[PDB]
Write a protein that binds this ligand. Structure first.
Ligand SMILES: Cc1cn([C@H]2C[C@H](OP(=O)(O)O)[C@@H](COP(=O)(O)O)O2)c(=O)[nH]c1=O
Ligand SMILES: Cc1cn([C@H]2C[C@H](OP(=O)(O)O)[C@@H](COP(=O)(O)O)O2)c(=O)[nH]c1=O
Ligand SMILES: [Ca+2]
Ligand SMILES: [Ca+2]
Lengths: 135, 135
């Protein structure tokens, strides 16, 4: 019967965004996952985890230019991720996350802490304003 | 010397978008790749390939709601991809691509051709307007 031939729409959603302190990029011919130096965003299932992922996706998606800046030490972590400061039209993602209270300054290792004080300043300002993680 | 401690920014880019006739979605708890029924976008290295990928990404990224609609036949192709019509706020991605001359109507198989004439109408209109593939 013609009445039984109609189709039906079902729900779907986007695939879960990766944690906000990580970003996938093509660097010198290589897709790779970068882990953002000196910061930690919460896990997906923790308060601010999805907001931090959304924030980094927004920064990456809107950027006319993305740049990677390695520090003086190791270029990868023990999980094989690239370790860098990531910039979106000249604005450092690692600093913005901290400035908005969506990441804490964390994972400070020798040789890879050039921007430590810069990020601590951003964190202090997020705390003073009681933003997100600091609210 | 303090002068040699400065870091340097290097180029990076987004990872290549997937072909415009495919979309990755979470469906009933499962991330999977859907191949859009009844259409074919060009390959990445063919004219309109990147424009078609960009178009589908734009539709998926802006949607408040995404829906999947299977046809009456096979739910997967021989590559293990889901076969469906994909809608973004009620607008069918498969039809839009064809309507803009970014995909041709193609891969018409028995049991999975419910929207064949709808898509042929969209294609005829893209051709009449000499859009993209038809220019
Ligand atoms: C940022 C950073 C993380 N890591 C490691 C420390 C943690 O692994 P261990 O717990 O095994 O020590 C992990 C946290 O990353 P995530 O916050 O992405 O989970 O990544 C580094 O080794 N170097 C770094 O610079
Ligand atoms: C759309 C569609 C494609 N396919 C197969 C046909 C082509 O594989 P064969 O060339 O091995 O026959 C391939 C084209 O997909 P792509 O355009 O994604 O490359 O996908 C189906 O089997 N069923 C379908 O409905
Ligand atoms: Ca983390
Ligand atoms: Ca194709």
């Amino acid at each position: 019967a013609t009445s039984t031939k109609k189709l039906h729409k079902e729900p779907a959603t986007l695939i879960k965004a990766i944690d906000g302190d990580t970003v996938k990029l093509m660097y010198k011919g290589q897709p790779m996952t970068f882990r953002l130096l000196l910061v930690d965003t919460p896990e997906f299932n923790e308060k601010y985890g999805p907001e931090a992922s959304a924030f980094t996706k927004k920064m990456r998606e809107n950027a006319k230019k993305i740049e990677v800046e390695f520090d003086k030490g190791q270029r990868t972590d023990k999980y094989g991720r690239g370790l860098a400061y990531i910039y979106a039209d000249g604005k450092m993602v690692n600093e913005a996350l901290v400035r908005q209270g969506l990441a804490k300054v964390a994972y400070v290792y020798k040789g890879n802490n050039t921007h430590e004080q810069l990020l601590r300043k951003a964190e202090a300002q997020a705390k003073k304003e009681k933003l997100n993680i600091w609210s």
